[PDB]
Amino acid sequence: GAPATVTEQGEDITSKKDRGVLKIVKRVGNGEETPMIGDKVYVHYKGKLSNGKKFDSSHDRNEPFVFSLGKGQVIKAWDIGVATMKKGEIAHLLIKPEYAYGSAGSLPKIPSNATLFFEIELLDFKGE
Numbered sequence: 001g002a003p004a005t006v007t008e009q010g011e012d013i014t015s016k017k018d019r020g021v022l023k024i025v026k027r028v029g030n031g032e033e034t035p036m037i038g039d040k041v042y043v044h045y046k047g048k049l050s051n052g053k054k055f056d057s058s059h060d061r062n063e064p065f066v067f068s069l070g071k072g073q074v075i076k077a078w079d080i081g082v083a084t085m086k087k088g089e090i091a092h093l094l095i096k097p098e099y100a101y102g103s104a105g106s107l108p109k110i111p112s113n114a115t116l117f118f119e120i121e122l123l124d125f126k127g128e
């Protein structure tokens with residue numbers, strides 16, 4: 001499925017090049033601009049554990065998820081990944097625990113050493 005394709009063909013977008021955050025562009029966005037640290041970013045997403053029956057989606061609430069890039073509301077992988085995206089882009093990210101909830105996890109929601117998969121659509125971003 002989608003996660004396996006990211007493993008096999010995804011680009012490593014980490015600085016350390018440790019394959020901690022792998023990305024496939026599923027739909028190319030518009031223009032050249034990508035968001036700056038501090039920008040408010042508006043997305044739709046679906047997320048799941050790799051090896052789990054936990055699934056989460058913005059589409060359930062039928063409203064975009066909004067956060068400030070780099071301000072710490074979301075996992076490191078999201079700060080790294082969303083910063084690479086253009087408006088209108090859809091991407092798949094596969095994420096090792098070091099860039100998500102680590103060895104500890106965050107129970108009950110997130111277990112120890114969980115790999116996460118997301119599909120993210122970057123709808124818009126706006127400066128502070």
Ligand SMILES: COc1cc2cc(c1OC)OCCCn1cc(nn1)C[C@@H](C)COC(=O)[C@@H]1CCCCN1C(=O)[C@H]2C1CCCCC1
Pocket residue numbers: 045047048049054055056073074075078106109110116
């Ligand atoms: C729908 O509720 C949740 C969704 C997800 C994780 C959740 C969660 O709350 C229960 O708990 C993680 C542990 C507690 N927590 C929450 C937050 N920080 N720590 C803020 C939260 C915004 C952090 O979430 C993220 O960084 C990522 C990216 C943004 C969208 C949600 N994210 C999740 O990790 C999901 C998670 C995805 C995989 C399947 C289980 C849910």
